[PDB]
Amino acid sequence: RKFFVGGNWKMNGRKQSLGELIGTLNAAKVPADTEVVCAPPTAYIDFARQKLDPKIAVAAQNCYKVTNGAFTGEISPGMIKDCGATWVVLGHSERRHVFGESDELIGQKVAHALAEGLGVIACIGEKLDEREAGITEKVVFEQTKVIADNVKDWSKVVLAYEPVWAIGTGKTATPQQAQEVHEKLRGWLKSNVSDAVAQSTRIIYGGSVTGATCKELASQPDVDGFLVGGASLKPEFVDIINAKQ
Amino acid sequence: RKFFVGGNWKMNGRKQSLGELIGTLNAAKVPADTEVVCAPPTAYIDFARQKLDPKIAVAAQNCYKVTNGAFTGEISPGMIKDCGATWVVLGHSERRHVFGESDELIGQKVAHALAEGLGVIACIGEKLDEREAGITEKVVFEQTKVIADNVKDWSKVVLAYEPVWAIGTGKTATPQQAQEVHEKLRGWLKSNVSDAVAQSTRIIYGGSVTGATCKELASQPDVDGFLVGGASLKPEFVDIINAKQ
Ligand SMILES: CC(C(=O)O)C(=O)O
Ligand SMILES: CC(C(=O)O)C(=O)O
Numbered sequence: 001r002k003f004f005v006g007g008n009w010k011m012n013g014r015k016q017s018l019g020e021l022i023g024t025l026n027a028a029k030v031p032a033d034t035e036v037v038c039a040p041p042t043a044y045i046d047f048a049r050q051k052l053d054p055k056i057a058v059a060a061q062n063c064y065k066v067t068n069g070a071f072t073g074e075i076s077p078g079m080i081k082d083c084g085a086t087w088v089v090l091g092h093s094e095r096r097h098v099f100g101e102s103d104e105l106i107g108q109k110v111a112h113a114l115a116e117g118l119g120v121i122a123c124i125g126e127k128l129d130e131r132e133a134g135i136t137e138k139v140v141f142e143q144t145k146v147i148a149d150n151v152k153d154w155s156k157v158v159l160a161y162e163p164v165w166a167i168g169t170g171k172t173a174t175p176q177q178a179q180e181v182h183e184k185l186r187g188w189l190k191s192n193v194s195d196a197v198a199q200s201t202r203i204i205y206g207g208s209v210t211g212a213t214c215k216e217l218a219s220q221p222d223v224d225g226f227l228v229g230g231a232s233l234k235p236e237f238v239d240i241i242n243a244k245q
Numbered sequence: 246r247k248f249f250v251g252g253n254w255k256m257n258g259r260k261q262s263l264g265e266l267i268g269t270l271n272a273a274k275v276p277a278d279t280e281v282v283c284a285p286p287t288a289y290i291d292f293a294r295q296k297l298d299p300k301i302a303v304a305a306q307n308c309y310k311v312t313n314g315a316f317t318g319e320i321s322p323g324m325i326k327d328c329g330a331t332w333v334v335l336g337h338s339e340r341r342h343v344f345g346e347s348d349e350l351i352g353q354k355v356a357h358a359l360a361e362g363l364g365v366i367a368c369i370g371e372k373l374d375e376r377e378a379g380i381t382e383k384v385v386f387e388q389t390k391v392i393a394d395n396v397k398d399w400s401k402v403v404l405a406y407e408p409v410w411a412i413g414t415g416k417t418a419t420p421q422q423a424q425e426v427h428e429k430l431r432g433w434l435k436s437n438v439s440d441a442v443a444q445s446t447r448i449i450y451g452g453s454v455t456g457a458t459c460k461e462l463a464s465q466p467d468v469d470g471f472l473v474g475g476a477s478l479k480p481e482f483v484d485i486i487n488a489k490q
């Protein structure tokens with residue numbers, strides 16, 4: 001599986017500073033068999049795609065589930081493609097848990113974005129109370145099932161595990177804890193989709209990762225890369241791109 | 246009060262067709278004492294601002310309540326300004342009732358967007374069940390109070406009344422029904438802010454409006470313009486700009 005490093009800029013950046021960040025990223029030497037994707041704020045998708053070299057792909061941070069309509073504040077896959085982006089992040093923990101997006105809606109978005117030709121970074125993960133109740137597997141398997149039920153072509157999908165229980169809670173996820181969930185997710189794909197899909201699908205880690213911790217995380221056998229948050233805004237992101245080196 | 250016509254493109258358009266629409270709008274002769282604002286999808290704010298003549302202002306369709314942060318899929322006022330837009334629509338019925346945005350959040354967004362120098366088109370309106378229960382005034386007064394509690398400078402605000410009870414319900418709002426709510430809102434401003442604010446604040450109508458109905462709606466004494474939905478994508482929008490002519 002090709003190592004996959006996504007940089008989610010979240011709601012950060014202006015043209016001057018994003019241009020600067022893009023210069024640093026363009027200058028990186030992307031190692032062999034490594035796929036890099038950046039997700040700018042929605043107001044800057046087109047801007048970022050124009051400035052980033054095509055060796056780096058661009059993702060929207062979210063989209064809606066139909067191609068046009070009466071949805072003030074939304075964007076559609078068709079608009080993402082028209083701006084030159086080729087991916088979308090769906091189901092991010094902030095959309096689910098700050099903005100209330102349901103599994104049903106996420107599945108509908110996945111189906112539409114994939115049908116329209118985008119790749120999807122599909123995010124899953126259990127919250128604090130779910131972790132404490134012992135239902136990690138039940139939660140992430142149900143989230144992954146909703147995604148899988150809306151996928152026709154698994155070559156267009158990357159799964160991102162976010163340990164929401166260890167983000168803003170006082171809990172720390174260890175590399176062994178991350179690996180344990182990634183292994184369970186891969187086993188779900190084996191039993192519910194196929195062994196081939198399990199073996200080829202990238203499952204990237206969306207918890208805390210820094211230049212100092214990325215090599216150990218990347219060495220976990222079922223961790224196939226990262227969906228990076230805050231470090232994606234800094235030159236340290238290049239070190240994370242090089243986590244397997 | 247300067248007549249105010251906003252065109253909310255909602256989740257519609259691609260570069261080719263939005264460029265076409267912008268050509269039609271640029272070619273319109275904006276009548277005296279008329280203020281025109283267009284709200285493109287977020288992926289096209291910068292694009293639209295570059296192509297629209299400055300005689301037309303650009304609004305974002307939504308924003309968040311801090312200037313940067315861990316809010317995948319959001320944009321901030323600072324980004325809107327960096328893209329050359331000078332307004333934001335806040336509290337739109339689709340954000341409240343499709344996407345679950347609370348009054349508390351809307352008030353926080355209003356405060357931040359205004360502090361950052363944007364104008365705000367602040368939307369209010371009662372749903373079907375609220376209309377049927379007889380609580381139109383209670384609902385829209387509470388929504389307007391939350392907005393007003395977050396306004397330091399009323400010259401930067403336009404209020405938009407959306408008859409949500411008459412959008413997608415089978416009910417029709419008559420011009421007299423729209424006028425009745427606008428008068429009540431203006432009276433709320435008089436009693437709770439000041440007479441001066443009541444007399445100077447534009448209260449625009451955000452229900453159904455077409456070229457065939459816009460002159461009658463515009464003639465209502467407390468209707469100061471429109472926040473137009475679907476007709477804003479068509480040449481008919483120019484007729485609505487001319488509703489007072
Ligand atoms: C911020 C946190 C949550 O929304 O619960 C997260 O997992 O990103
Ligand atoms: C669509 C409708 C609602 O969301 O209830 C509206 O008022 O826009």
Ligand SMILES: [Br-]
Pocket residue numbers: 170171172173
């Ligand atoms: Br811990």
Ligand SMILES: [Br-]
Pocket residue numbers: 415416417418
């Ligand atoms: Br009716």
